[model samples]
Target: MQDRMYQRFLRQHVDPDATGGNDAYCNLMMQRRKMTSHYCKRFNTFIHEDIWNIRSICSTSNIQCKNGQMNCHEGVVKVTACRETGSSRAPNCRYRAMASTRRVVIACEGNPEVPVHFDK
Candidate 1:
């Protein structure tokens, strides 16, 4: 059963209105979310909005998931996209960030309605 696993993934990847989009910020935040000193995440994104605000995107009309799922929605939101530097490794994972506000497709699931995946 994958119960509540979505929330776990959410906490690891989503940081609301975070102000860090640099190497130092990535180092600290990645570790803070426990994605470092073990296996570095290849990439991540920090949504620049309230958690519930993003979740509420699910309420918009359904959109097509690239994977062909029926539970996706398109919502425009602010985000900081982080990509690992070429010379990075576990424990020293570093990243560069970009800011964008665009339409992102998200997959949501379960009752109470929550976003479960970044479809794009």
Candidate 2:
């Protein structure tokens, strides 16, 4: 990310003190580099089939996620992971472990997409 706009962008979209997790920021910089650049080309639009494909691959296929998680892979704005509903907080497990659990929720993000997480 461009440093000059980093603070302004983050503060505008995310809480300045929300300083950790394996959320959107970690994923793009880690697992989805190619997709991130592609999305940025379109002004950072996150709702695309490419993202959907990734989400499908990340979700648990046979665990029977409560929200029909496997079937919700289409038209996702950005993917998220957590231990359960009513709380979007990420679990203590690593990203790979969380992916195996398939308890994540992918939600729609409005304009000027914000970085989901930060780990420096």
Candidate 3:
């Protein structure tokens, strides 16, 4: 479960210091982070903010999960979304960059404190 949560963070959030401004960034990241095992993750968003700020989203507001599961929460955040290029393929995936401030939904459990799932 913890490993899954860590993967979610890689997809939904990554420190700004970790990003590179080129296609190689996505290709390398997808593999290094294990998101390109069977196939490439076509699209993903990486938050360029503090991890603590993201963790605190659990205390913000409650929301239904995208698939109608219980114990979900939502928060607005600024992020950089990476999308695969039209001609990209596995092991050599390329990406285009996009930026947005949008709402992010997460699922929580235990004390209902830290986020455990990326619901959206």
Candidate 4:
């Protein structure tokens, strides 16, 4: 079930045609991706690389999960993070362009080849 969401995350979040690493990128993407339904999301990240490359992280270097588990692996990739600012607060949240090479920690499952939890 969670693996399905991860697949959707790759499609909706990463590799957008015209919406990558910009100030207004988050304000539009969070809602379009359904991460801003009930309330505005404070922070979220979207990868800006190929989907296959992101999935291959499941077999990368082992790392500790944020929950203190040992099922996570680390992979570095280009990403854009959308973080809310104090000026807009909740409903009308603003965003800043934060692009970088992020070390993502992901939990793998199934055939031991799928990314499930996107552990910090």
Candidate 5:
């Protein structure tokens, strides 16, 4: 499964438009499980070389937070709730969704003639 996961990662990271026939770019998120820290620790560590980082991740965040918050990456076409909302200090924060603050390039070798590619 890990190989498949890596393949998916490479496909999404190395070549996104080649996948579902969409002229879109994607990022492979590989999360590392560990302890917790809010102020000092970030929940989602941004992959600097991540394709999504090269294309989007910025120009999407609607608002900024005082807590040094992060928004969904723009490569994600949508952001859906992955889990139930909890009665925390911020209800919106608990909801799972894509980023909006960072800008990723979705860096992969695209067709030299085309801006974005699809597998049609």
Candidate 6:
């Protein structure tokens, strides 16, 4: 179960030292990260920091998650959210990048509890 948690962090949230807006980052990374397959993922975010940076969020006070869980924490982190562009389709998937810094909510889990999911 916890293995899955670590995998999600590697697949969905971790992206060290990244910054871009050309949409190519989205298109390429999405496919490279295996988010785009038979069907494209509708939305996804790539945080521009090391994995350890997020793990510490778990030490913060509990907060409500987007899905109503109380195992979340809020922290300001730079990110690039990739959203499917209008009329985009599988095999030729496309996206638009929305990059910004904000107090992002993240869900935590495991022994030395670490962020495993993005709440926003």
Q: Which residues of candidate 1, in runs, are more than 4 Å off?
A: 1-3
Q: Judged by lDDT relative to the true structure, which candidate is superior, 1 or 3? A: 1
Count of clashes in candidate 5: 23
What is candidate 1's CA lDDT for residue 55?
Answer: 77
Ten residues in sequence with the least summed lDDT for candidate 2: 92-101
lDDT per residue for candidate 5 within 1-120, as digits (tens), equals 434543443432342232221111111121211112121122232222345433443344323333333322234332111221243232123323233333332212222211121111
TM-score of each: 0.87, 0.17, 0.76, 0.81, 0.19, 0.91
Using lDDT as the yardstick, the better of models 4 and 6 is 6
Per-residue accuracy of model 3 over 75-107 as CA lDDT, tens digit each: 777766778887988766677777677887877
**lDDT by residue for model 4 (51-90), tens:** 6777788878777888888778888778888887757665
Cα error, candidate 1, residue 91 (Å):
2.4
Candidate 6, residues 57-95: lDDT per residue as tens digits?
889899988788899898888888899997798878999
lDDT of each: 0.76, 0.28, 0.69, 0.73, 0.27, 0.82
Superposed model 5: Cα runs more than 4 Å off:
1-14, 21-54, 62-68, 73-120
Give per-residue CA lDDT, model 1, range 70-119, as digits (tens). Answer: 89998887777778887986667888777778778888888766777777
Ranking by TM-score: 6, 1, 4, 3, 5, 2
lDDT value, candidate 1, whole model: 0.76
Using TM-score as the measure, which candidate wins? 6
The RMSD of every model to the true structure, in order and in angstroms, is: 1.8, 15.0, 2.8, 2.4, 13.8, 1.4
Q: Which candidate wins on lDDT?
A: 6
Weakest 10 consecutive residues, lDDT, candidate 6? 13-22
List, residue by residue over 4-51, the lDDT tens digit for candidate 2.
Answer: 343432322232222333444434433333422322211121212242
- Any idea what lDDT model 5 has? 0.27
Sorted on lDDT, best first, the list reads 6, 1, 4, 3, 2, 5
In candidate 3, the residue pairs with backbone N, CA or C atoms under 3 Å apart (3 or more residues apart, or in different chains) clash, namely 13-47
Clashes of each: 0, 2, 1, 0, 23, 0
Better structure of 1 and 5 per TM-score: 1
